[PDB]
Design a binder for this molecule. Structure first.
Ligand SMILES: *[C@]1(C(=O)O)O[C@@H]([C@H](O)[C@H](O)CO)[C@H](O)[C@@H](O)[C@H]1F
Ligand code: NA
Length: 382
C-alpha cells in the first residue's frame, strides 16, 4: 500500500467533555450534560466536519431527558486539527423530557440528512427504571406514545441550522414495532446516487435528486438492531451489524434488490457493541475501514482495520487505538464513528467512560476525537 510509505500521523483529544471535566460542554442556554454518548460524524461537501452525540443530561442511561447535540468545525478548511478548530456545543433537537438520539447522518450534495430515534420520556427499553424525579419508566411498547419513533431533520446550510424534525415512523418503521434504532453512526450515498441508512431489521433507502429525496424501507431478514452500511469496491452493499450475543460481527452482502443471509464473521470479534465502517476510497487500491472493540467481551479493545477486498471479506489486524492513548478522559472504548477528512485522514469519534460508579448510571461518559492517516494504521506493530 503506497500510503504506508508516508510518515505516520495521529492526533487525539476530547471533543465532547462531560460535566465532571474541566471546561465541560454546555449549550448557550446554560444546559449542561452529565454524559455524552452515541457519536456520529460526517464531512460535508464544503470540508466542514459535523460531529453529533447524545447529550445525556442527568446520568449515562439511554432513556430519560437526552438531547441530540452537535459541534461543527469553525471553518470548512481546518479539518478539526486542534481543539480550538471546533465550535462550541449546539443542539439539533432537545424538546421536552424525551429521548432524542441515535444520530445517523448522511451527506447528499448540499443537504445533510440526519436520521434519529426518539422515545417519550416516560418510557425505557426495559421499563421499570427510576427517573430523576423518582418516577418509574414504562416499557417501550407498540403504542404510538410508547414506541420508538424515527425522525428526520435536514440542514441545507452546512449544519448551521436544522429543520424541525419530521416524524417518519408511520412510513419508515414497520407497523406494530416497539423498540427501534436507526444507526447509530452514518448512512451512505451510493455510486449510483441513492442514499442508504442502516436501521433495526431494515435499510432506509432515499431516492430522488440530491436534496429532494423520498424514502422507503428495505426489510431485511436476520439483520441486527444497530447496523452499519457501506458500498464495497465491487459496488455491492454490505451490512455489518452488532450481534445479539457477544462474540462477532454479523455480516450480509447484496444490492438494493436484497441482501443475502447474515452470518457471523469470525474475523471480527465484537462484544455486542456498536461499530463503524467507512468506504475510504474506490480507486486503486480500494479500501474499506472498520472500527469496533476487537474483543468478545469488553469495549476497551478499540481497533481500526483496513480491508483491500472487493467485498471487504477480510480485514487486517490493523491498529489498537491504545497505541496512541489519551490521558485524562477515562477508559477509552465503546461506540464509534468515522469520516474521511479533506486532508486525507480518518477522523473518528470514540466513546470513553470515567467509570466512577463502575457500570452504574452515575459514571461520566465523554467522547474523543481522533485523526490518523492510513500509514498510522498500516505500520501498526502487529
Ligand atoms: C447501546 C449500548 O451502549 O450498548 O445500546 C443500545 C441498545 O440498548 C442495544 O442496541 C440493545 O437494543 C442503546 O440504544 C444505545 O443508546 C447504547 F446504550
Ligand atoms: Na430535552
Amino acid at each position: 500500500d503506497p500510503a504506508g510509505k508516508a510518515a505516520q500521523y495521529h492526533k487525539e483529544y476530547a471533543l465532547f467533555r462531560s460535566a465532571n471535566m474541566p471546561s465541560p460542554d454546555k449549550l448557550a442556554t446554560g444546559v449542561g450534560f452529565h454524559s455524552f454518548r452515541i457519536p456520529a460524524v460526517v464531512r460535508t461537501n464544503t470540508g466542514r466536519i459535523l460531529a453529533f452525540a447524545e447529550g445525556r443530561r442527568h446520568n449515562n442511561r439511554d432513556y430519560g431527558d437526552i438531547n441530540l447535540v452537535y459541534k461543527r468545525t469553525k471553518s470548512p478548511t481546518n479539518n478539526g486539527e486542534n481543539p480550538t478548530d471546533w465550535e462550541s456545543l449546539r443542539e439539533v433537537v432537545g424538546t421536552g423530557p424525551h429521548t432524542w438520539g441515535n444520530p445517523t447522518p448522511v451527506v447528499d450534495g448540499n443537504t445533510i440528512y440526519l436520521f434519529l430515534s426518539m422515545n417519550d420520556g416516560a418510557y425505557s427499553q426495559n421499563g421499570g427504571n427510576t427517573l430523576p424525579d423518582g418516577t418509574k419508566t414504562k416499557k417501550i411498547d407498540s403504542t404510538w406514545v410508547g414506541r420508538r419513533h424515527l425522525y428526520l431533520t435536514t440542514s441545507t446550510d452546512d449544519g448551521d441550522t436544522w429543520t424541525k424534525p419530521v416524524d417518519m415512523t408511520k412510513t419508515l418503521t414497520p407497523d406494530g414495532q416497539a423498540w427501534d434504532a436507526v444507526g447509530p453512526g452514518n448512512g451512505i450515498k451510493l455510486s449510483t446516487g441513492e442514499l442508504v441508512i442502516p436501521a433495526q431489521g431494515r435499510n432506509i433507502i432515499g431516492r430522488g435528486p440530491s436534496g429532494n429525496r423520498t424514502w422507503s424501507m428495505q426489510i431485511l431478514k436476520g439483520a441486527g438492531s444497530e447496523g452499519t452500511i457501506c458500498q464495497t469496491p465491487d459496488g455491492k452493499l454490505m451490512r455489518n451489524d452488532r450481534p445479539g450475543p457477544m462474540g462477532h460481527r454479523s455480516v450480509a452482502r447484496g444490492t438494493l434488490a436484497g441482501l443475502g443471509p447474515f452470518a457471523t464473521d469470525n474475523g471480527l470479534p465484537d462484544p455486542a457493541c456498536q461499530g463503524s465502517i467507512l468506504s475510504y476510497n474506490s480507486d486503486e487500491p480500494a479500501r474499506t475501514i472498520f472500527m469496533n472493540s476487537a474483543s468478545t467481551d469488553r469495549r476497551t479493545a478499540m481497533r481500526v482495520r483496513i480491508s483491500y477486498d472487493k467485498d471487504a471479506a477480510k480485514f487486517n489486524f490493523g491498529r489498537e487505538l491504545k497505541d496512541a492513548p489519551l490521558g485524562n478522559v477515562g477508559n477509552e472504548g465503546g461506540y464509534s464513528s468515522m469520516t474521511k477528512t479533506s486532508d486525507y485522514k480518518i477522523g473518528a469519534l470514540v466513546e470513553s467512560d470515567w467509570y466512577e460508579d463502575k457500570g452504574g448510571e452515575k459514571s461520566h461518559r465523554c467522547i474523543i476525537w481522533r485523526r490518523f492517516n492510513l500509514s498510522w494504521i498500516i505500520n501498526g506493530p502487529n
